Ligand binder design. Structure first.
Ligand SMILES: CCCCCCCCCCCCCCCCCC(=O)OC[C@H](COP(=O)([O-])OCC(O)COP(=O)([O-])OC[C@@H](COC(=O)CCCCCCCCCCCCCCCCC)OC(=O)CCCCCCCCCCCCCCCCC)OC(=O)CCCCCCCCCCCCCCCCC
Ligand code: BCL
Ligand SMILES: CCCCCCCCCCCCCCCCCC(=O)OC[C@H](COP(=O)([O-])OCC[N+](C)(C)C)OC(=O)CCCCCCCCCCCCCCCCC
Ligand SMILES: CCCCCCCCCCCCCCCCCC(=O)OC[C@H](COP(=O)([O-])OCC[N+](C)(C)C)OC(=O)CCCCCCCCCCCCCCCCC
Ligand SMILES: CCCCCCCCCCCCCCCCCC(=O)OC[C@H](COP(=O)([O-])OCC[N+](C)(C)C)OC(=O)CCCCCCCCCCCCCCCCC
Ligand SMILES: COC(C)(C)C/C=C/C(C)=C/C=C/C(C)=C/C=C/C(C)=C/C=C/C=C(C)/C=C/C=C(\C)CC/C=C(\C)CCC=C(C)C
Ligand SMILES: COC(C)(C)C/C=C/C(C)=C/C=C/C(C)=C/C=C/C(C)=C/C=C/C=C(C)/C=C/C=C(\C)CC/C=C(\C)CCC=C(C)C
Ligand SMILES: COC(C)(C)C/C=C/C(C)=C/C=C/C(C)=C/C=C/C(C)=C/C=C/C=C(C)/C=C/C=C(\C)CC/C=C(\C)CCC=C(C)C
Ligand SMILES: COC(C)(C)C/C=C/C(C)=C/C=C/C(C)=C/C=C/C(C)=C/C=C/C=C(C)/C=C/C=C(\C)CC/C=C(\C)CCC=C(C)C
Ligand SMILES: COC(C)(C)C/C=C/C(C)=C/C=C/C(C)=C/C=C/C(C)=C/C=C/C=C(C)/C=C/C=C(\C)CC/C=C(\C)CCC=C(C)C
Ligand SMILES: COC(C)(C)C/C=C/C(C)=C/C=C/C(C)=C/C=C/C(C)=C/C=C/C=C(C)/C=C/C=C(\C)CC/C=C(\C)CCC=C(C)C
Ligand SMILES: COC(C)(C)C/C=C/C(C)=C/C=C/C(C)=C/C=C/C(C)=C/C=C\C=C(C)\C=C\C=C(/C)CC/C=C(\C)CCC=C(C)C
Ligand SMILES: [Fe+2]
Lengths: 258, 54, 281, 307, 43, 54, 55, 43, 55, 42, 53, 42, 53, 43
């Protein structure tokens, strides 16, 4: 069919290219609707549904049957924050920042925010706790790199606020997730392995200052950590990057300081 | 024959889907082969028989 | 215009320039200082492309081509009708890109996430600046850059590619093509695996990360892990771009002959350059 | 100058994970191989076990014979000289038959006949492996997304070597088995068909190949950015949306106006890569069979300045 | 032994039907080959 | 020959039947395609030259 | 070679038979393609020359 | 012994069928080669 | 040499026979293809010239 | 004994393997002898 | 001598596998080197001796 | 030691291994003798 | 001397493996150098000496 | 004194065996070099 045109320059190649534009337009519509199963319908800055919802309608709900008898999850579904947001409107007009009413790191707002996940430990495929301390882990040991256990923990203010005691390990993935840092008060906090930089002789935590180490949310059980506790810990530490900028001694922090 | 027992071995749903797709694909393939040949191109056969071409 | 969870993350701070002067949201977009620069450079760049269509005398979007200045003008200014517009658009495009990356930086600080995304985007910009700025400057002519046309910037690729014979023999190109193919292979595998573990056979429970590792261990005997695959995705893409930027910055600057001629060094190694038989001699 | 999570700063080595056992015949599964510290810096250190069933054996036997047949022809082209073999390794080639023979199997064994044998082994090897991906997913009860994502790759692979040669009525149109030969085949393909750049479907595949690099750079960086909130565990974020999923959602919502989910981003991922070869197969299939010159085709479709 | 889990009686029944299909399939093929050879033989 | 039934004690009939069905179809396609490849035994061209359809 | 039957005390019959069928089919195709490769023994061409099917 | 789990009698019976097929396959192969050598000897 | 049976105390017979089966076939194919490659010992071509099967 | 086989099982396994090996070698010798007569290579 | 003690240090499984691979690759490498040379290419020289060409 | 083989096991393992080594080398010597007679390389 | 104490510091398994690879690679490197030179290529030497070419 | 956990007497015997192989290996090398020098000296 070389040069065979049904009409004008339209031929088999022209047939295919237009038919794909129709397919691609349909496919982009399908992909976008699937992305609308979370965070929708939209809401006003107060909490009421907005007059605008987008050109793409919501998809027909689908149900995820969670593992280990945790139940089912149907999305799109009614989603609620399930926590008081300690934020204050800074302007009646929308599209303006909300300032924290008090201490944002303690109030869990902004970069220090967290979500009301299920207050249960995350399970592996066998039903055991995915994240366990290396002491309670069976056979786990440091295989390479500098062992952070026993190293002093230095905050962003260049002050030592404790030392590492234990490492928490994701048992299926077999990689470290948390550092169990013991403070000066005898209690041990959890620090995500992604927020620390194990140097030659110390654990430098650029996120938090020495005084803020005590403020990390604690775990209910020393042998396991729930999803909710992970979010509070991960939120608090990562919230320290913006909310401990005045306490950071870095040169770039001073340049970007207010 | 006792060929009915194959439905105890094979799931009817999957088999029927396989038959439909295979028969359709086979039907298209033979028709496309025939059109490809200068002979058996019944569009061209009718054109020559009734002198459609001018 | 807010998601069901967006409110608690909308707080001041994290801005690099301007403080609260531009710290506001227009719909879903966050504006920032660099977003204002983004919109201006984006709008100005788009209009000059449309205005360049007027000067060219065509309105077909595929025929629209903002050619760079001819080789006679070297690396100086050019008349707007014959290359000067391209220089303004390139400056606008460069401004829009870097402002976009820096706007992403402000959003990173406001959310407290890492700067991997703007660092990943900066690799693309340096890839872009390689073609329009770094390579033409070394070759001493804006005309070695590519026109801002849908099908005329392909003519540049084909013409530049065939300047050096078959461009496939570019060794940095072979590295980058292997990375681009590998990254797409990884993305298809990674996307399909999670969907298979999240949208399993009807009635069966949503699968766990262990099934993801079990599937690929039963398949190819090794699972890189959820953390590894996203590290792999980032590094495969950046390496592909890094070697693609490298492949062009050495072409016409350090290597000038056909790239197939380059590969004869391996054939001409001292211990087998003269052995009879085979393909070469 | 902080920890960017690109490489693990500590490794832990527990007992080897033997994997799930939904419906996998453990007899066909092998044992656990070594632990690679070098691999452990980037991802998991454990290698193996690997399942080897009926389709696994057929895939390996045909895959080995395909690999072996190319190697023997590579040795014959070297004159059985190990020094020549390493010197001309990339320049070796198992060329398909000459255009005169067409689709006939009458080509001499040294003039294209061997390529047909090697190509048959690859054909069986790949198709048997595709079923292996299908059956491994079915055994664990997962979706067949890999099986159909693979079938996208097969479509381009089938087109280049099998389907397009049949339509062109000549094995000479197929791909030679060599490093530089199949590069030269690629270049000769465009030149014969008149600047394959102006192929609309080739342009689309580049769009999705660029987009796959774009999306994986975007997606990989996003998860590493939100890995400090445990965002790398994407399956739990799909099940129970944590703060990483929300921040990842919000970053792209505030950046480019729209976002995705933790599960919907992987739908973009699979379709971005599938269309790479899906549009690729049509693009190659049309070339020669429908369009003998794309630039002339581009001129008549308003893609080139002339005409 | 007995990996399939079938019974010997079931195995005999399954094989009996299977061979019946095989002879039918082979019978068509033999007729098919004979007709082709008469029409155009390859020897 | 008279004790071949024991294969079904060892092999799952589901897997064997699928494998045989795929094998027979693929083999049949291979042979029909091999004949069409040669100028001879292309029964489409054979009848075309027989009745002078050209 | 009576003790040969002992091979099944170690080999799994399912694995061997699958390997056997795969091996023989791949071997049978390889020989048939090799014969078709040579201008002689190409039984689809010797008959064509014998009966002058093709000019 | 324990690698397969079969007994000596099962292996003896299993081998007997396998060789029965093998000789049938071999016999048909020998007849096939003779037909080729008669029609077109390769030596 | 009488104690060579001790090898089966170290090597798994299943692993060895699979390794040997692959090895022997790949060796046999390699040798047969070497003979076909040479202008001589290409027994198909030899008999073709012997029987005037070229034409 | 890594394999866990007893010596008597290994003696049996070797006896079958060597019987197979000599039969395989015996056919190979006839094959080489037949080829050398048909076309010697020395 | 007392070389038997090397088996106390070296795992017999690893060594025999490594040796089996080593011996075959050495045998293959040597045979190919001879086949490469116009001399000792016993296939080529026998054809010349009997005037096969 | 590392492998857990007893000294008697090591001696037996070495004894048969050397038996194989001399058997392998014996054929190699005969092979080199035959090649040197047929075509010497010195 | 007291060279026996080097085994008090080195793992015998790793050293023997490294030595085994080292000696073989050294032996191959020397044998290839001899073949590379126009002289000492004993294959070439015999062919010229016995008039094989 | 405990890097490898090897006893000092074990090291003495291990080295004694190792040197025995080293002299045996070098003895063959000397015989090999001697034959080559007789066959083709390199000085
Ligand atoms: C932004 C992207 C804008 C797309 C620009 C496309 C374009 O430049 O078309 C120019 C076109 C006129 O160009 P022309 O050369 O004078 O052709 C005039 C007639 O179209 C045809 O007159 P002609 O015969 O002289 O030109 C020949 C040729 C070229 O004519 C064309 O220009 C075809 C342009 C098709 C545009 C796509 C229309 C999409 C409609 C859905 C919305 O037309 C054809 O042969 C048919 C091609 C289209 C067949 C489509 C059938 C399947 C449609 C399914 C959807 O102007 C437009 O209509 C653009 C409309 C964009 C709306 C926004
Ligand atoms: C001068 C050369 C020509 C040209 C000629 C061609 C040709 C010809 C083709 C492409 C194709 C492609 N080209 Mg182009 N291309 C050119 C210029 C470009 C440029 C550029 C910036 O200039 C880019 C980015 C591209 C990009 C691309 C890709 C989008 C596309 C291939 C997808 C893919 O993954 O294929 C590689 C992947 C596969 C082929 C799939 C393989 C799948 C199978 C199943 C794998 C089996 C594995 C096997 C058994 C081995 C196993 C090994 C063991 C595991 C160890 N081209 C110029 C214009 N291009 C292809 C296409 O589809 O075009 C439409 C194509 O055929
Ligand atoms: C498969 C891969 C296809 C790649 C080619 C297309 C990629 C771009 C897709 C753009 C898209 O879907 O954007 C929708 C979005 C729509 O988002 P929006 O800003 O209208 O708000 C979100 C809309 N709802 C609420 C319905 C989800 O487009 C844009 O925001 C502008 C993109 C410009 C291009
Ligand atoms: C091509 C490469 C282009 C690279 C551009 C990088 C721009 C980085 C801006 C960093 C600003 C840091 C800073 O303290 O600047 C202080 C000032 C702005 O200070 P400010 O008063 O907005 O306060 C910054 C601190 N906060 C917001 C937290 C209170 O920077 C400038 O002068 C503006 C940047 C100029 C951009 C030049 C574009 C050309
Ligand atoms: C962005 C597109 C990226 C991927 C391109 C794939 C190929 C698209 C072209 C194609 O197939 O064309 C022939 C086909 C069919 O050709 P046609 O001949 O039927 O219609 C074209 C009409 N004339 C001849 C007047 C040009 O074209 C189309 O289907 C139209 C696609 C138009 C896409 C235009 C994008 C414009 C973007 C804004 C302008 C930016 C300028 C800087
Ligand atoms: C390149 O080489 C070429 C192609 C040129 C030459 C080809 C060479 C080769 C390699 C050729 C190979 C040929 C082969 C291996 C052919 C094999 C053919 C066979 C064995 C075919 C068997 C067919 C069997 C059939 C169709 C059986 C059908 C059975 C049924 C329909 C009934 C099934 C129902 C049952 C059992 C229900 C009973 C169930 C219960 C539970 C009681
Ligand atoms: C490049 O080289 C070329 C291609 C040129 C030349 C090729 C050379 C080479 C390398 C050739 C290789 C040839 C080889 C190795 C051939 C091997 C052939 C063999 C071993 C064939 C064996 C066939 C066996 C068959 C068909 C047996 C079938 C048996 C049955 C159908 C019955 C089985 C049933 C049983 C056991 C019942 C189950 C029992 C119980 C108790 C439940
Ligand atoms: C490039 O070099 C060229 C190709 C030019 C020249 C080639 C050079 C080289 C490197 C040649 C290499 C040759 C080699 C290494 C040949 C080795 C051959 C061997 C070792 C063959 C062994 C054959 C053994 C056979 C066929 C044994 C078969 C046994 C059976 C069928 C029975 C199996 C059943 C058993 C053992 C039952 C088990 C019993 C109990 C009680 C558990
Ligand atoms: C480029 O260089 C060229 C190629 C030109 C020249 C070559 C140069 C080089 C580098 C040549 C290298 C030569 C080398 C390193 C040769 C080494 C040869 C050796 C050491 C061979 C050893 C052979 C040993 C054999 C075959 C042993 C066989 C043993 C058995 C069959 C019995 C095994 C069973 C056992 C041990 C049972 C275990 C016992 C109990 C009680 C469990
Ligand atoms: C381009 O330049 C050219 C090549 C032209 C000229 C070259 C110029 C230059 C710059 C040449 C460089 C020369 C240099 C820097 C040479 C350095 C040589 C050295 C440092 C040699 C040292 C050798 C030491 C040896 C061999 C030591 C051996 C030790 C032992 C055998 C015993 C070890 C065992 C012990 C200690 C047992 C452990 C003890 C206890 C108590 C457990
Ligand atoms: C470019 O340079 C050219 C190629 C031109 C010239 C080359 C130059 C150079 C740089 C040459 C380098 C030469 C070197 C460094 C040679 C070194 C040779 C050595 C040190 C060889 C050592 C050999 C040792 C052997 C073979 C030892 C064997 C020992 C055994 C088989 C017995 C082992 C068993 C034991 C210890 C049992 C364990 C005992 C107990 C009580 C547990
Ligand atoms: C020393 O090394 C040894 C000898 C041990 C082993 C080494 C082996 C080596 C060096 C292998 C090298 C392999 C290479 C360089 C492979 C490269 C492959 C490439 C670059 C392939 C690229 C494209 C290939 C394509 C698209 C092939 C497609 C094939 C098909 C779709 C199958 C077509 C099926 C056909 C023609 C069936 C025809 C047959 C019948 C009976 C109908
Ligand atoms: Fe992901």
């Amino acid at each position: 069919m070389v040069g065979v045109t049904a009409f004008g320059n339209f031929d088999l190649a022209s047939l295919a290219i237009y038919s794909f534009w129709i397919f691609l337009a349909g496919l982009i519509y399908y992909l976008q609707t699937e992305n609308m199963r979370e965070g929708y319908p939209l809401e006003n800055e107060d909490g009421t549904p907005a007059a605008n919802q987008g050109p793409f309608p919501l998809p027909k709900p689908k149900t995820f049957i969670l593992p280990h008898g945790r139940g089912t999850l149907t999305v799109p579904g009614p989603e609620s924050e399930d926590r008081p947001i300690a934020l204050a409107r800074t302007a009646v007009s929308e599209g303006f920042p909300h300032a924290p009413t008090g201490d944002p790191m303690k109030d869990g707002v902004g970069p220090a925010s967290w979500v009301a996940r299920r207050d249960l430990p995350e399970l592996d495929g066998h039903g055991h706790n995915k994240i366990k301390p290396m002491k309670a882990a069976a056979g786990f040991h440091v295989s390479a790199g500098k062992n952070p256990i026993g190293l002093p923990v230095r905050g962003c203010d260049l002050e030592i606020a404790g030392k590492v005691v234990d490492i928490w390990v994701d048992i299926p993935e077999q990689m470290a997730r948390f550092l169990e840092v013991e403070l000066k008060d005898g209690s041990t906090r959890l620090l995500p392995m992604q927020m620390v930089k194990v140097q030659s002789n110390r654990v430098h935590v650029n996120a938090l200052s020495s005084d803020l180490f005590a403020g990390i949310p604690t775990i209910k059980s020393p042998t396991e950590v729930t999803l909710l506790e992970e979010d509070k810990i991960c939120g608090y530490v990562a919230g320290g990057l913006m909310y401990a900028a005045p306490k950071r001694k870095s040169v770039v922090a001073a340049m970007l300081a207010e | 024959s006792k060929f009915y027992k194959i439905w105890m071995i094979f799931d009817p749903r999957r088999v029927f889907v396989a038959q439909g797709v295979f028969l359709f694909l086979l039907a298209v393939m033979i028709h496309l082969i025939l059109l490809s040949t200068p002979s058996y191109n019944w569009l061209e056969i009718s054109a020559a028989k009734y002198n459609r071409v001018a | 215009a807010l998601l069901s969870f967006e409110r608690k993350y909308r707080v001041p701070g994290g801005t690099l320039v301007g403080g609260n002067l531009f710290d506001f949201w227009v719909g879903p977009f966050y504006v920032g200082f660099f977003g204002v620069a983004t919109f201006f450079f984006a709008a100005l760049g788009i209009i000059l492309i449309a205005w360049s269509a007027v000067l060219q005398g065509t309105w077909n979007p595929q025929l629209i081509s903002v050619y760079p200045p001819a080789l006679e003008y070297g690396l100086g200014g050019a008349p707007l009708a014959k290359g000067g517009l391209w220089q303004i658009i390139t400056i606008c495009a460069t401004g829009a890109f870097v402002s976009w990356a820096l706007r992403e930086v402000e959003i990173c600080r406001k959310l407290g996430i890492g700067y991997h995304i703007p660092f990943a985007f900066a690799f693309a910009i340096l890839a872009y600046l390689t073609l329009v700025l770094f390579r033409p400057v070394m070759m001493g002519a804006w005309g070695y850059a590519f026109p801002y046309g849908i099908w005329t910037h392909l003519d540049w690729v084909s013409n530049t590619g065939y300047t050096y014979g078959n461009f496939h023999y570019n060794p940095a190109h072979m590295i980058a093509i292997s990375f681009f193919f590998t990254n797409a292979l990884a993305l298809a595998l990674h996307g399909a695996l999670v969907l298979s573990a999240a949208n399993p056979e009807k009635g069966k429970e949503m699968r766990t990360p262990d099934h993801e590792d079990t599937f690929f261990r039963d398949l190819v005997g090794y699972s890189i892990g959820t953390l590894g695959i996203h590290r792999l995705g980032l590094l495969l893409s950046l390496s592909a771009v890094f070697f693609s930027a490298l492949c062009m910055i050495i072409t016409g600057t350090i290597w000038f002959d056909q790239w197939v001629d380059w590969w004869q060094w391996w054939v001409k190694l001292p211990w087998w350059a003269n052995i009879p038989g085979g393909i070469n001699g | 100058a902080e920890y960017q999570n690109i490489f693990s700063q500590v490794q832990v080595r527990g007992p080897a994970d033997l994997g799930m056992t939904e419906d996998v015949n453990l007899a066909n599964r092998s044992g656990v191989g070594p632990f690679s510290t070098l691999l452990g810096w980037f991802g998991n250190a454990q290698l193996g076990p690997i399942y080897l069933g009926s389709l696994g054996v057929l895939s390996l036997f045909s895959g080995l014979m395909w690999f072996f047949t190319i190697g023997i022809w590579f040795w014959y082209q070297a004159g059985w000289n190990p020094a020549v073999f390493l010197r001309d390794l990339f320049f070796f080639s198992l060329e398909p038959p000459a255009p005169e023979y067409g689709l006939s199997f009458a080509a001499p064994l040294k003039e294209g006949g061997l390529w047909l044998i090697a190509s048959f082994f690859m054909f069986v090897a790949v198709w048997s492996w595709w079923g292996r991906t299908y059956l491994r997913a079915q055994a664990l009860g997962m979706g067949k997304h890999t099986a159909w994502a693979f079938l996208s790759a097969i479509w381009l692979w089938m087109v280049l070597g099998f389907i397009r040669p049949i339509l062109m009525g000549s094995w000479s149109e197929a791909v030679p088995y060599g490093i530089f030969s199949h590069l030269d085949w690629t270049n000769n393909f465009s030149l014969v068909h008149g600047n394959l750049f102006y192929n609309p479907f080739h342009g689309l595949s580049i769009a999705f190949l660029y987009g796959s690099a774009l999306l994986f750079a975007m997606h990989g960086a996003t998860i590493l950015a939100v890995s400090r909130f445990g965002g790398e565990r994407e399956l739990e974020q799909i099940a129970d949306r944590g703060t990483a999923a929300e921040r990842a959602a919000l970053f792209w919502r505030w950046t480019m106006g729209f976002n995705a989910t933790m599960e919907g981003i992987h739908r973009w991922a699979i379709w971005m890569a599938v269309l790479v070869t899906l549009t690729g197969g049509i693009g190659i299939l049309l070339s020669g069979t429908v369009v003998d010159n794309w630039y002339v085709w581009g001129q008549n479709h308003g893609m080139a300045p002339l005409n | 032994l007995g990996y399939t889990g079938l019974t010997d009686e079931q195995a005999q029944e399954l094989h009996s039907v299977y061979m019946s299909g095989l002879w039918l399939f082979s019978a068509v093929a033999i007729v098919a080959h004979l007709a082709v050879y008469i029409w155009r033989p390859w020897f």
